[model samples]
Target: IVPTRELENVFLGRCKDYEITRYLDILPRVRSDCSALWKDFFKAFSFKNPCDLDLGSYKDFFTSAQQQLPKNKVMFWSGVYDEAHDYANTGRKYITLEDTLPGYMLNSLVWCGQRANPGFNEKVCPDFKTCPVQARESFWGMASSSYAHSAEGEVTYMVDGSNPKVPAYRPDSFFGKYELPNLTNKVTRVKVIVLHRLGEKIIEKCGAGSLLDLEKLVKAKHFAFDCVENPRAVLFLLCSDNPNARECRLA
Candidate 1:
């Protein structure tokens, strides 16, 4: 992948040449080592066939990409990505994955380096499921795990009560597979925000459904927790969107 540092820098500046190109505007704001970070990141995948890659292979990349954010600030979202992002943005201090450096670099984007090709092609890179590993899955999987493992104080996750799934937490989710297992002893609590739009029939709630499964898991993990079914604390902002919806009326 190193056609030489200058070439890498030029290509990196273009980011159009790689899957992580979207970070052209994001990386500079997040860190001073953007160029070196890009180089190392490219090299990590560029040497292997996308299908031959392994998620564990990039552990060091994430280690360097990690920034020490305030504890209790993580705002993870399961079925409510937009609402969560909006929640974090409306001037409150919650930080979503996309708000972080690594998350910003890879949010919603897909890339996989070919054995001989050093760049990206979203049109053709193997889908993550079919291939044993690829850039985006490993990146998010490991990053999410790291985020959960490193949490401190009260950690917040915006879950979806609207999900009919028993536990609400998808076992295959980044939160399920990587995040929960990685949660550290430093994490004092897992605060869950069960979000739903107005007018929708509430399909589930705390203690009765999959949310209970989540509670059981958290308890097993030894983390204290609080589950609120649409607490007005932050969700009222979401609730107001449909000012006349039934679910918005009252308890």
Candidate 2:
């Protein structure tokens, strides 16, 4: 794989845009110095083995760029990125980790450091398949860890419910390994939402399939667990894409 070319410029641009938007007053504080943020971000992977980058390298960058998540508004997802973002409604209802500054700026972009001068490798980077600890993977892992740690109040967890082949609760996903485990004791409850695609068979719901395990897990952690299947708002978002579909028509 190849690191995103002009990665520094892209990072700064997104940082500026994210601050300019001012999604809410809930942001505890803002990092206006995009240049400094870029410098710290670049240092994390620069002049290092891209494939062997460790999660600790990005500690300072995350510290500087991280924002406080609002209570009762934090949401984590598995196998549902676009749908989760749509459901989040740009932080109006819920805020996913991607809604945070660092997460937003880094999403969908790839980069890695080089052992040579100038830091980044423009020609190529390591893929997660070959490298057990890739630069991008480590970045997200740390991000998710911090996000989950900072989460408070009631949090929402969304998982794809349409596919039976894949478990709704995956222990290997960042949500399972980092987010779920790091959620602080301040969290009072976890609302698990199992979302099914429009007109797709509902293979799993509350108290069934993988969700049952999730319930037990959440309770074991000393937090109340609430499960909802195909929440009305999420289902409505699905309907918007296929208004003519049978599910969209009123019974």
Candidate 3:
């Protein structure tokens, strides 16, 4: 994750060397399960065609790291990366991708390697622009599935309801395609937080548009789901940055 090209673009100066090393050092300790974590993680995609790879081909890295995720602990977010991240980590009360090993490592970077005649050609690699699969997507696909599969209680995704796209979840996104199905019967509910930035007129909302489509999708999987418009918890986040704090407070 921290070792690739894709992510360097997102987190080049955001983190220091030690910040990445901490996670690198912790991977082998996960589950005390094996020493091959780093080895097996990349081995899954070492020689494969970058553009077309299956998400399941690298399931072993996760198969070895599986553990029961805590109840109502995991949180997913889309479109509201910074705010959702602040809410997830401000007081360390909940878990998000940043809290996971792969997430911690891959959080803000992009990386995909090409196979050289002898080995991996790290000097040059493909971004999402060249091919969708490559090495990076495989890592996330597997990591997303592993993380989603470990959930055993309520789940929530902070969505950008501001958009009018149907189904809310992007079928091409990690949460939409790989993450949702893995929620399993262990998940009892899916909570969607519809966030409206400060001063933005609220046009679309819960029980309508994309939010409604999201609810139907959740039920199709047999899980109860609902959308809450401008939940106080999220509003609190927005107000913190609001220039017109008084207006935000009255809402």
Candidate 4:
């Protein structure tokens, strides 16, 4: 992965938007220093081997920018990111971890430090496929963990159900490894929503296949568990992308 051009500027802009404009009302107040947030984030991997950095390197950054998630408003998505965020509506109905400060600022952006210098490598960064413990994935992993830990009330989890080959919930997935285990007693229930593609077959849903396994896991944590298959609200968001599709037709 090549480092994102002007990464600092993009991050700062995203933080500013979160604090002053977009999500001003979502958080109780703006407590993060945008520049300092970037510094902590950058210092985590800069001048180090990108593939060998520690997850703990981001502790200061996460602590500084972390906010208390609104009760019953947090959403977690496995393979249904686009559909999930569309349904989230930027915190009007719900707030995914991606809608928060760290996630918002770093979403889809890539960066890694150079071994030769204390700066981002403009040439190329290591691919996650070859480098298991790289900068980008580690950041998201830590962020997802923290997000799950902060969830309260009931949390909504969206998973893809269009393909049977890919299990709805994988034990090794970020959700399983980082998010699920980190969910504290602050969260009382996990509502699994399996979403299928508009024209595809539904492979897994509530109380079936991998979902049963997920239910068992959730209950083991002492959290209440409920699930659904293609709720209308989410279906509407999926339909929005294909308004002319046969299944999307109102008539």
Q: Which candidate is the best by TM-score?
A: 2
Which parts of model 1 are misplaced by more than 4 Å?
1-32, 117-123, 133-136, 165-167, 249-251
Greater-lDDT candidate between 2 and 4? 2
Q: Can you write out model 2's per-residue Cα lDDT over 5-80, one digit (the tens) per residue?
A: 7898898888888787757565555664899898888888888877767778899998888787788999999998
Pairing residues by index, what is the TM-score of model 4? Answer: 0.92
lDDT of 1 by residue, 86-174 (tens): 88872246766676666655555546666554454334556467764444466677778776766678888887766555346777777
Q: Candidate 3 residues 161-251, lDDT tens each?
A: 5564534466777787778877778789988888876675565688776667677888999998877877887787788788575547463
Q: For residues 1-251, could you state the per-residue lDDT of candidate 4 as single tens digits?
A: 57788887898988887787877778655476788888888888888776767678788889887888899888888888778888888888999887788887888887777778645687787786666654446787889888888889999899998876889999888998898999888889999898889888778878877899999999999999999887888778878888876777774
Which of candidates 1 and 2 reaches a greater TM-score? 2
- Which is superior by TM-score, 1 or 4? 4
Worst ten in a row by lDDT for model 2: 23-32
Error of 3 at 166 (Å): 8.3
lDDT of 2: 0.83
Error of 2 at 184 (Å): 1.0
TM-score of 2: 0.93
Candidate 4 structure lDDT: 0.83
How far is 46's C-alpha from truth in model 1 (Å)?
A: 0.6
In angstroms, give how far residue 239 of model 2 lies from its true place.
Answer: 1.5
By TM-score, the candidates rank as 2, 4, 1, 3
- How many clashes does each candidate structure show, in the order listed? 3, 0, 7, 0
